[PDB]
């Protein structure tokens, strides 16, 4: 029942890495409530107000030679340093997907068959999941939940396939992920 | 672009809540427990390769509070607009009776970063073994958050993730049950 006005202050120090640390872009974003008002982009070299609220600050910080020089070295002293420290368990993190196939536990339309290909606990998020009706990618009648974050450095994604149970058919879910040298496959005995 | 590391911090008035965390491609590397004055690694293994002096975070937060006070006045005391959360409940993995699993309550796209989340089993609150993440940053400056509930699948149990937020007309309930 607390309806008092809230006032929020956010500050984000961003380090964007391209091709290893070949190219690094440092960014300081100051956000009031939900509006970024001040920003320091390593590509610009100085603070600049994004909204009027940051104008006073941009003018002040820029007039601070020492400070301004420190922020100009962030790409190295801050960004590359941290990247070096965390690379081993972040940039290099890799967890193989656990693939399982099964028919949806709930069905609407009863002559068709909803097959579910669950790809669980993988990392990085980059992944390719495809269906194959014996040796023909059923690019049609395929719906996916898209990439889903579990919040614990693992992703999951379900790719459903609408089918019609016919004797002799052997559906196969094929998964490609950077954690494996060859694609993972799981067949479904119809 | 390939990888992004973000040091995200915030201070909220009048709640007087502050947060300091590091994000790597949308996942939390660690955050600092303001109360215990200690760094908390998202995954235990992280702390076996890196360290972080929590005192550094505490200093930044005290500064953020001081800065907020000035910004609040400078803005003519304009408060933040409540943006209600999107809530989804899912399982860590495909369920199977008697196989331990985890229920995930994902609270997304909301602000300010204050939310009350509760887990309900057959209508009664449950807290045994539950855990949660701090508020995670979004590029639009709203927030994300994860709540977890380990459980033993049962065809007789019905679970709810109950979410409260000032931007909601009523508390929200997201249902999940074996089926």
């Amino acid at each position: 029942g607390d309806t008092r006005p809230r006032f929020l202050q956010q500050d984000k120090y961003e380090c964007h890495f391209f091709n290893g640390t070949e190219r690094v872009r440092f960014l300081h974003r100051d956000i009031y409530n939900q509006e970024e008002d001040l920003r320091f982009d390593s590509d610009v070299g100085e603070y600049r107000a994004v909204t009027e609220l940051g104008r006073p600050d941009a003018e002040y910080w820029n007039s601070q030679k020492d400070f301004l020089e420190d922020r100009r070295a962030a790409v190295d002293t801050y960004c590359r340093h941290n990247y070096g420290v965390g690379e081993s368990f972040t940039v290099q993190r890799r967890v193989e997907p656990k693939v399982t196939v099964y028919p949806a536990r709930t069905q609407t339309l009863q002559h068709h068959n909803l097959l579910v290909c669950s790809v669980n606990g993988f990392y990085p998020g980059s992944i390719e999941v495809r269906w194959f009706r014996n040796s023909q990618e059923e690019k049609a009648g395929v719906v996916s939940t898209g990439l889903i974050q579990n919040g614990d450095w693992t992703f999951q994604t379900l790719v459903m396939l609408e089918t019609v149970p016919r004797s002799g058919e052997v559906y196969t879910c094929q998964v490609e992920h950077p954690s494996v040298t060859s694609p993972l496959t799981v067949e479904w005995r119809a | 672009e390939e990888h992004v590391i973000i040091q995200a911090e915030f201070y909220l008035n009048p709640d007087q809540s502050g947060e300091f965390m590091f994000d790597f491609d949308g996942d939390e590397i660690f955050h600092v427990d303001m109360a215990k004055k200690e760094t908390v690694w998202r995954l235990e293994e992280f702390g076996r390769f890196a360290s972080f002096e929590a005192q550094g975070a505490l200093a930044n937060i005290a500064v953020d509070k001081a800065n907020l006070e000035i910004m609040t006045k400078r803005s003519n005391y304009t408060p933040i607009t409540n943006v209600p959360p999107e809530v989804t409940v899912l399982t860590n993995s495909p369920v199977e009776l008697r196989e331990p699993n985890v229920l995930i309550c994902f609270i997304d796209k909301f602000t300010p970063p204050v939310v009350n989340v509760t887990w309900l089993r057959n209508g009664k609150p449950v807290t045994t073994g539950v855990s949660e993440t701090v508020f995670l940053p979004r590029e639009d400056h709203l927030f994300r958050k994860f709540h977890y509930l380990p459980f033993l699948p049962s065809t007789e149990d019905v679970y709810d993730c109950r979410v409260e937020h000032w931007g909601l007309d009523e508390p929200l309930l997201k249902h999940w049950e074996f089926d």
């Binding site: 006073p56 002293t77 941290n82 420290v85 | 590091f22 890196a50 972080f52 975070a57 006045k73």
Partner: peptide
């Protein structure tokens, strides 16, 4: 001298008072 690797945090400075 085992050596410890620390993540570094950017230090946020105090905003000056508006004055008057």
């Amino acid at each position: 001298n085992p050596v410890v690797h620390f993540f570094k945090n950017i230090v946020t400075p105090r905003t000056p008072p508006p004055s008057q």
